[PDB]
């Protein structure tokens, strides 16, 4: 779906949902009373993976899964993890993102079945109990998500510009599978809230060239871009993989999830 493809600079994504890093950290401080900074980024990785798995189960294309992931991040960029259960928010984000597409629909039974099946077969280390939410809960949550996002549903991602850049290099076969995979990994971080997607694409492509020992220095020099901002992104990607190495989500997530601030019940 190429709807609005060249409109990023006048888009709601750019004008409203590219956030300041210090505004992000300030709002995060309320959840940092319960979880450490390390534990917070580990939770983000966990729910990125949950959303990926839900999307794969439903056979949604990568771009739909990415949009869903961005919805999730935008919600918790503003609000505490206690506000709505992230276990409910994740499938709600996938459901809403799938409805922005007109090529096929995700049914109600299929959404709930997919949430139930993915959590029990792929995430039982984190969830001993069955997915407790029914479809009325998803529909309620959807209204809150749409409201928080100020109805901003069209999300731009690095996949489209990455594809253009590698085709411009003449190195699609060698570099695209790795570069694409690295773009997927950037959703384990805040990068999508902080930088235009084409910059994230350029960084992923740089890391892919370094990993494969491809000299693309002249090609990067031929671009008109702020390479300081690209290097900032590269550092977050390189750090992501060290975090990945040292993180065992399977051993740690049950404990980390138990430290999440819990919803205040009604009086």
């Amino acid at each position: 779906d190429k709807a609005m493809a060249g409109n990023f600079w006048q888009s709601s994504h750019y004008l409203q949902w590219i956030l300041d890093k210090q505004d992000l950290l300030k709002e995060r401080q309320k959840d940092l009373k319960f979880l450490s900074e390390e534990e917070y980024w580990k939770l983000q990785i966990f729910f990125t993976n949950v959303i990926q798995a839900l999307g794969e189960h439903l056979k949604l294309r990568q771009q739909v899964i990415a949009t869903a992931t961005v919805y999730f991040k935008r919600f918790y960029a503003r609000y505490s993890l206690k506000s709505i259960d992230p276990v409910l928010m994740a499938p709600t984000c996938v459901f809403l993102a799938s409805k922005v597409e007109e090529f096929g629909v995700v049914s109600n039974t299929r959404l709930i079945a997919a949430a139930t099946s993915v959590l029990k077969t792929r995430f039982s280390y984190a969830f001993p109990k069955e997915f407790p939410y029914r479809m009325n809960h998803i529909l309620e949550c959807e209204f809150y998500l749409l409201e928080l996002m100020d109805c901003c549903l069209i999300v731009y991602h690095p996949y489209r510009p990455l594809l253009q850049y590698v085709q411009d290099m003449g190195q699609e076969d060698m570099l695209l599978p790795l570069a694409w995979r690295i773009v997927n990994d950037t959703y384990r971080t805040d990068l999508c809230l902080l930088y235009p997607p084409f910059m994230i694409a350029l960084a992923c492509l740089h890391v892919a060239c370094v990993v494969q020992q491809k000299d693309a220095r002249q090609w990067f020099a031929e671009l008109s871009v702020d390479m300081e901002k690209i290097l900032e992104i590269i550092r977050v990607i390189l750090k992501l993989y060290e975090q990945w190495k040292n993180f065992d989500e399977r051993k740690e997530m049950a404990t980390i999830l138990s430290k999440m601030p819990k919803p205040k019940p009604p009086p």
């Binding site: 493809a5 409910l88 409805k99 007109e102 096929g104 309620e140 959807e142 749409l146 409201e147």
Partner: protein
């Protein structure tokens, strides 16, 4: 939800703007294709607004896509979403727009009725066509098809700061697999009638061609009397009665259309030998050597790959010929078209 945080929940509920608090709309229904003519309750504007309550409950695929695209689209000739209300109790969705007093269905109907009480101003015709093309060009440049263009969807602003500006509205924002085959034929391009499996930019341009003819004559050019199947025999018969039957050279790929063999079975070239757009338009006092006509003929090209694009149509010498198109299609003149009446029917 019981597992939602209570404080979070009551804070949002306390702050949430409700449509019924901000706007007076009860008794002010104007259309239902539920559309209301609304005024602000504080009295800080005195402007008129269109409130659309979306059909159904929750957020359907069609509702999602409509909200998604309107939230991004910004152009003087495309209707502009001001605000979305989410009504949590009944799970109803409301869309706020600036109110367009007029539209081409009513404007044309007014001229067609005036002909009986015995033409549409030609500076106005040109200016309308230019703005329709400008708005459609913007949508198309963003890979957004309308998919349902007709006079009822070409709104025209009344008295106010945007006097006589066209506003394209009611885009077909959701079609499953971008397909006409999934659940008036007067503005439908011949490829749709021969079973085209997808909507295209070209399909929109044909519809503009139809609207343009209708503005010039006051009659729907492919008027015809009123299922799942795309093939409509009587509509095709009408197209050929106006246009002539296409020669092989005019539309080489016609043979590839899914309904081509049905066309061959039901129709004979010989039937339409005295038929042409030239002949049709002459009968309605439009000269075939006019720049208006030559552009019209480029819009109403039968083979979609031979149809002019919106951008090329905007460059047509027609728009450089006196009189120049104006930003107010009424050109500062008094507006004779009546306002929309409030409906009181149950």
């Amino acid at each position: 939800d019981d597992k939602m945080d209570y404080d979070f929940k009551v804070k949002l509920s306390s702050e949430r703007e409700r449509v019924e608090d901000l706007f007076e709309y009860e008794g002010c229904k104007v259309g239902r294709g539920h559309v209301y003519k609304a005024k602000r309750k504080d009295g800080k504007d005195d402007k008129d607004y269109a409130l659309k309550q979306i059909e159904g409950t929750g957020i359907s695929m069609s509702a999602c896509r409509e909200i998604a695209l309107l939230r991004e689209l910004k152009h003087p000739n495309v209707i502009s979403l001001q605000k979305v209300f989410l009504s949590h109790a009944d799970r109803k969705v409301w869309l706020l727009f600036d109110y367009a007093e007029h539209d081409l269905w009513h404007i044309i109907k007014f001229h067609r009725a005036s002909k009986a009480n015995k033409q549409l101003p030609r500076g106005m015709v040109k200016s309308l066509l230019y703005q329709i093309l400008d708005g459609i060009h913007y949508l198309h440049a963003n890979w957004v098809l309308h998919r349902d263009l007709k006079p009822a969807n070409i709104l025209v602003m009344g008295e106010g700061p945007e006097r006589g500006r066209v506003k394209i509205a009611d885009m077909g924002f959701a079609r499953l697999f971008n397909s006409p085959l999934k659940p008036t034929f007067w503005y439908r391009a011949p490829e749709l009638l021969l079973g085209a499996r997808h909507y295209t930019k070209a399909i929109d341009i044909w519809a503009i061609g139809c609207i343009f003819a209708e503005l010039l004559t006051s009659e729907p050019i492919f008027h015809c009397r009123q299922t799942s199947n795309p093939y409509h025999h009587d509509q095709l018969d009408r197209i050929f009665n106006v246009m002539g039957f296409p020669a092989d050279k005019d539309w080489e790929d016609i043979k590839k259309m899914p309904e081509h063999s049905t066309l061959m079975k039901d129709f004979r070239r010989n039937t339409y030998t005295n038929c042409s757009l030239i002949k049709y338009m002459e009968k309605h006092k439009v000269k075939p050597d006019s720049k208006a006509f030559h552009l019209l003929q480029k819009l109403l090209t039968m083979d979609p790959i031979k149809r002019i694009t919106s951008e090329q149509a905007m460059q047509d010498p027609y728009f450089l010929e006196d009189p120049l198109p104006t930003s107010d299609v009424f050109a500062g003149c008094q507006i004779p078209y009546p306002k929309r009446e409030f409906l009181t029917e149950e």
